[PDB]
């Protein structure tokens, strides 16, 4: 799984970042991660994404839906939830769990 995702990243020439979610996680770090992704244009692979708080899953749903809509209209500048300062975006981003 992670090998195939990383290999697709490698053959596309992009930089993949793998992280390990756990029950001790909170949404502030997930938001930091997603902001870094949308700013840089790298790929993200949250290995073992299920072993995390249902609560975190819920708020991550809102965050990921916001960024998905943001990428949908091909708009250069977009607004991120819980974070007041407006933030940019680079198209060639991706999510994997």
């Amino acid at each position: 799984k992670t090998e195939t995702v990383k290999d697709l990243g490698r053959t596309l020439g992009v930089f993949v970042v793998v992280t390990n979610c756990s029950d001790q996680h909170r949404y502030r770090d997930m938001a930091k991660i997603f902001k870094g992704l949308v700013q840089s244009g790298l790929w993200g692979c949250f290995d073992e994404f299920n072993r995390i708080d249902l609560e975190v899953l819920s708020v991550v749903a809102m965050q990921v839906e916001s960024i998905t809509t943001a990428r949908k209209q091909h708009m250069k500048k977009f607004m991120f939830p819980e974070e007041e300062i407006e933030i940019e975006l680079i198209p060639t981003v991706s999510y994997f769990i």
Partner: protein, 96 residues
């Protein structure tokens, strides 16, 4: 299959106001609590979602829906969940 559209169409024909919605999770306990308190003092409608997860807020609900803390009339509550055992029957004994 989801009746959320239907329930919302219902909140528009007999009730005059759009319901408020909170998806169950983190930064949502206090969020669901404060919107419930707003529904308590006004009499609006609240739509909880994904109660099959984030069960720690469920046991609080039965204490909230009580004759002690008075609630304004017309306040309804709509709960949606899925098949998750280890679901305390506090509301399962008292619900529709």
């Amino acid at each position: 299959a989801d009746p959320t559209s239907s329930i919302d169409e219902l909140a528009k024909k007999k009730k005059k106001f759009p319901c408020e919605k909170v998806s169950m999770g983190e930064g949502q306990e206090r969020v669901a609590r404060q919107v419930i308190m707003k529904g308590f003092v006004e009499g609006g409608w609240v739509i909880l979602q994904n109660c099959h997860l984030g069960l720690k807020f469920m046991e609080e609900i039965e204490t909230l829906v009580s004759p002690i803390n008075q609630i304004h009339e017309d306040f309804r509550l709509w709960i949606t969940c899925e098949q998750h055992p280890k679901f305390p029957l506090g509301l399962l004994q008292k619900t529709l």
